[PDB]
Design a protein around this ligand. Structure first.
Ligand SMILES: NC(=O)c1ccc[n+]([C@@H]2O[C@H](COP(=O)([O-])OP(=O)(O)OC[C@H]3O[C@@H](n4cnc5c(N)ncnc54)[C@H](OP(=O)(O)O)[C@@H]3O)[C@@H](O)[C@H]2O)c1
Length: 303
């Protein structure tokens, strides 16, 4: 019943540390043998909570070696999920279950199609963590993780050992309604924060734009069958603005650091989904066209 962890980043290490320190079998899957040596010279994962650093010596390995994988946590970026899961597709057993921690939509379905003999569970986390070195992660803020599977709504029995490890979670019968809620939340805030180069509190100065975006995002939510999310969206957005008024959004921090943006699974997925239907979403489309041009202007990928 080993917890295999693919993607020893921010969320990946935070999960690996909490699972391993609670006595559960955990195994890190690092990229190559070079990373495995750099991990063994460090001695384990360093977790920083309220300034206090602790060393968790979690066993690690490479994709080629190891035992069969019956439970895998995919904790990489959405644009790397397809390539990550395929690197250990040769070790997946017939009863393997995958926990997909990716943000947005699109990559989860791509992983499910690439691995049809495995069960892919969807997750939506609000926990905060960032890296401060190759094997050092700061537990920046507590949060919650929703779980669920659209095909198989029965909850697995191993949810209890997530509680033992201190990992807050809840099983949702309609997990896609959660992901669409968080996706529409991301589209109304993060693209404008990049184009205007401002904190989330700065969006108060653009109230007409927020209302126009939430309107088109509300139509997209209703056509997707999520009526409750579309009615409360405008007030859900304004609540997040006040709660994170002093913060820079995640997409703003990616562009600032010259990193790739998960746009292809957030605003890009939303504009494509409305096209698959029949909804004209012009303001979301021009917002996407501006954000793509903003990314290309700095040599960053537009997808
Ligand atoms: N971080 C948060 O607080 C947070 C909160 C909510 C949601 N999320 C979502 O969770 C996901 C992960 O975010 P993160 O901040 O944890 O990212 P991150 O810091 O970039 O960690 C991703 C990790 O995956 C590894 N990886 C990528 N492709 C791989 C491959 N093919 N084989 C092996 N390892 C591979 C990377 O290795 P390298 O070190 O070599 O690059 C990296 O360690 C994202 O979709 C994000 O939107 C994150």
């Amino acid at each position: 019943m080993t917890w295999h962890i693919l993607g020893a980043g921010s969320l990946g290490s935070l999960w690996a540390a909490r699972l391993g320190r609670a006595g559960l079998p955990v195994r890190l899957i690092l990229r190559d043998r070079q990373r495995l040596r750099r991990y063994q010279q460090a001695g384990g994962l360093s977790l920083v909570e309220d300034g206090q650093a602790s060393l968790y010596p979690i066993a690690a390995e490479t994709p080629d070696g190891g035992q069969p994988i019956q439970r895998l946590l995919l904790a990489c970026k959405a644009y790397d999920a397809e390539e990550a899961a395929s690197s250990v597709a040769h070790r997946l057993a017939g009863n393997a279950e995958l926990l997909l921690l990716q943000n947005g939509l699109g990559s989860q379905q791509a992983v499910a199609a690439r691995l049809p003999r495995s069960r892919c569970l969807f997750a939506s986390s609000t926990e905060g963590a960032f890296r401060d070195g190759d094997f050092r992660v700061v537990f920046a803020g507590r949060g919650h993780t929703w779980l669920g599977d659209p095909r198989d709504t029965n909850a697995p029995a191993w949810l209890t050992q997530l509680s033992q490890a201190g990992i807050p979670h809840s099983w949702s019968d309609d997990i896609l309604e959660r992901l669409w809620r968080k996706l529409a939340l991301n589209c109304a805030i993060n693209p404008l924060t990049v184009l205007h180069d401002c904190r989330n509190g700065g969006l108060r100065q653009h109230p007409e734009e927020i209302a126009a975006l939430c309107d088109e995002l509300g139509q997209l939510l209703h056509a997707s069958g999520y009526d409750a999310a579309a009615r409360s969206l405008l007030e859900d957005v304004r609540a997040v603005i006040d709660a994170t008024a002093a913060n820079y959004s995640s997409m703003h921090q990616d562009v600032t650091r010259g990193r790739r943006t998960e746009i292809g699974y957030l605003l890009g997925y939303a504009c494509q989904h409305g096209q698959r239907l029949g909804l004209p979403l012009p303001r979301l489309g021009t917002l996407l066209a501006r954000l793509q041009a903003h990314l290309r202007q700095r040599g960053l990928p537009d997808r």
